[PDB]
């Protein structure tokens, strides 16, 4: 189940279509298992990197390409997925909060990048980077302050499970009785580092914390 | 409140700034003579 | 999603706690090299040896050797942990050499507190990638410094 | 300078307009300063015309144009003053705009060379241009005003509030030019860091005006312009200024909360703001109520003070016991206007004895009924119950009093249909009569009902 | 004078015979504030029928006072005994003409002024109370005799046609719509005022306007005027048919019991008013390249791009004024280098690098910043693009020590 979900979420069209075809076959005998895995996989990756985390990495990478490699077509393709997720609407309070603080600047800067695709003036692209860089400075000033996360703030769908038939990741052998996920701790701690990993603690069906 | 027509909005803008400014600039730049 | 291994702490933090308790600066060796030659990063190959060799002679490296003994409740437990540490570091040295692991700085080296085993993390640089890079190419098959070789046993390696 | 006022108008016109150029030789700046003042005096006598004042309008602008390029601030200030008396109608203004004088008018706005007297003259001229014809306002002057307002606080500029007051006036008569240059974002960012009650009310009113008329809502985006003021409370880590000193970082958060609080209150008292913040779809009110349930202590204490001011309720004192906080909300509490020096009995009797009106409609109750209904629809009551049973001791008491006030307000202002299922509190009552939940949570809910019941008796007694 | 209010709210025995007469003598006091305070407490006493009859039999003179006196005088029309006294010297006919031309719309200002002082922090030169001011049309419908005058004049038809066909374009004609909504609401405050109001089918028109209106201010105005309609049992039944509820208890008892009414009415579902139709946003409807591969000195071993003859300080006066053409490969490559650093300065990505590059040019070639055309090009670019204030002040400051002899020479010649 775990490798298929990763394959089904891949960018490549060939891998995406092939993985889904295998998934629907498993839905016949066990439909509720794949549905829970899709929900868990989408929420866990959301917690790993937040909206202000993606933009901080995306803008920093895009700036290096434009000013170091002088590539324009390669800069837009980096920022296209970032603007794509904002058009699907926030699904939580944290995403809604980001869409209010920096929503206007990011959406307007996209419009200026759209005029450069047609007019071709260098001033339009330069004026677009006046808004991208202003937001990048603001986000960089609040990353160190991020030291703890609340599940209700980032993803309410995780703490409302209370029961799951999905096995705990990383532990499954056919010769041993299986242990399933019972609950997820409502708060997780962020380790202060360059990558800022999170500490997720699950709860096994046998009363052992993972 | 009914701050709808621009007649009262214009009066409110040029009254709050003059009355509640620590620096003596709005009292000299918002003169009603210049209309 | 990486599993969390309990009862293990990184080597860098282990030495840091010992030195600060003994009122010893964390970077004594680094300060001596800069004091003797501030432009250490620009010295030639032969000149860096003189500065590096001088630093290791004026400071006795035994922090890890004494650290493992002060955390042993008795002498029977101390000997058992030391034996595991010596023959667990050797396994990863040869296996890591075949795999070509690189960038084995102390932050990526973890020592088990209860058993004395050695655990490696961050398998990012493999197949001699770190040796061929143009920025500070390391030229060592694995990590075997004076601090580690002074803790396995008194007779040496 | 010697004002002749004896020769013919064309004869008197030639002298000052000839010494204004001077080819930068043979004429001192002091004489040019006095000559410009003569033009203003001469213009007062003979009316604005091209047949009596010698040359045409275009020739006068050309010689007047070479007055703002001088290195003396006094001469430039006088040159700007002369232009103000010259521009009277749109025909004259359009001739000034044709010669691209705005490239020099905007130049004098931002030089910051201890010329505050000159800068006042330049801004006073801008207000003249808007009044004469706001549809032909140059984009060069507009961009200068935005820059001095968008980033006029970090540079310790003293004429920062005087430039925002002009943008708002311009935004009411020509919103198109202001919208293009991002002038609407400047006003939104100003209310975040402006903690003056009267000024903050004025700035937010201008933006809400653009959301009132149907033909002006096209200049404001849907869910990112107005909802900017909710960022300090919705975002736990808010950074308004990318570059600021870390010494007053703690004080900066307090200033932002106070300034943002006066903005949320100001937009809930205008019909153009109530409807936009309570749309049936995703709205700011649901995010504001939704963030209240999150177990955060800094936001919750801030939000409760907002709720008291929206409904205009007396704030209790900070304490951990309900009885002490209950004695500070009673209508019969002593006030400083009841002494012998102040109103002895007449001032006291106004707030104790009831008004002799049983049929006169009260327009303020109608406003509160609509506001209260909107919050109940979004789920305010369910949010408060969570706060009461899942917060600190000194926060639950403030929430319990607020819940008690709303219930008493709802059984006398709201119609029966809205309030017939309101006094039952299904969520709070089930947390009381439940032995499956932890005992500490159960008794907090049970104690809340006993404390809430005693609030009812206080209103039953009335003022004394 | 302020102490006569506590004697009014305490229900002192026989207050309507000795207390009222003391408020008429005090009304003619020398000080305006004392006289103004007497009117405030006298209007409150007029809400009791016994006190109101006392004033009518005393027939005081309130015409010499201000608008407060005029509004207090209009309450005499609500009593048939006082209506006959006033409708005998030719007074109600004068008021009807004056209440249709001059200050019919000023009643809206009185409504807005009280609300703006109550909760706006405006203060035109603690929970207050905002009570509905006395209106002529709302006091004339209490008795059938007064209602007869309102119908023969045929004022209802004039107001109703103003609601069914609103013009929400000019800010002056919108206030006329408000002047009609507040006029219709006072008529519906009595049972005899609803008989001649529901026969033209105007109440549903207001209800439609209260939920589907382009101007949000008009949408909120309809909510208040619908409260005045629900002051009677008959009026509340009409609103209930259209899914609008209202309170059915007076204010005399603060503990109502479900088995005169205060004016309040809200829709059954509050979301039926907060819906607004979406409107699309209005915005929805070279040397730079070659420079990065070379150096300034290497290349050396018309330049204005956006320079047309309409947006230049000197070039625009060639035709209108009559100036002479300006005069001058070494200097043409310096304009582009100066211009390209201006555009790169608009992003603020590397301000120090770009600022350093412009300072060197002004030192090595101090005469390049002495052409009016270049200044016009830079000034034009500062309008379309956006610059930070410290960066914007950096530009337009390298040009402070310039002479611009070309403009001075030409201006002197044409003027002389
Ligand atoms: Zn030119």
Numbering used by the authors:
A (entry chain B): 1973 to 2182
B (entry chain H): 2 to 36
C (entry chain B): 2236 to 2392
D (entry chain F): 25 to 488
E (entry chain F): 733 to 857, 872 to 1005, 1423 to 1448, 1479 to 1494, 1510 to 1536, 1607 to 1694
The authors write:
(a) Composite map of overall and local focused cryo-EM reconstructions of DEPTOR-bound mTORC2. Consistent density for DEPTOR is observed in two regions of the FAT domain of mTOR for both mTORC1 and mTORC2, in agreement with a regulatory effect of DEPTOR on both complexes. (b) This substrate recruitment site on the FRB is occupied in mTORC2 by Rictor.
DEP domain-containing mTOR interacting protein (DEPTOR), conserved in vertebrates, modulates the activity of the serine/threonine kinase mammalian target of rapamycin (mTOR), a master regulator of cell growth. mTOR acts in two functionally distinct multiprotein complexes, mTOR complex 1 (mTORC1) and mTORC2, and DEPTOR is the only protein reported to bind and inhibit both mTOR complexes. Biochemical analysis and cryo-EM reconstructions of DEPTOR bound to human mTOR complex 1 (mTORC1) and mTORC2 reveal that both structured regions of DEPTOR, the PDZ domain and the DEP domain tandem (DEPt), are involved in mTOR interaction.
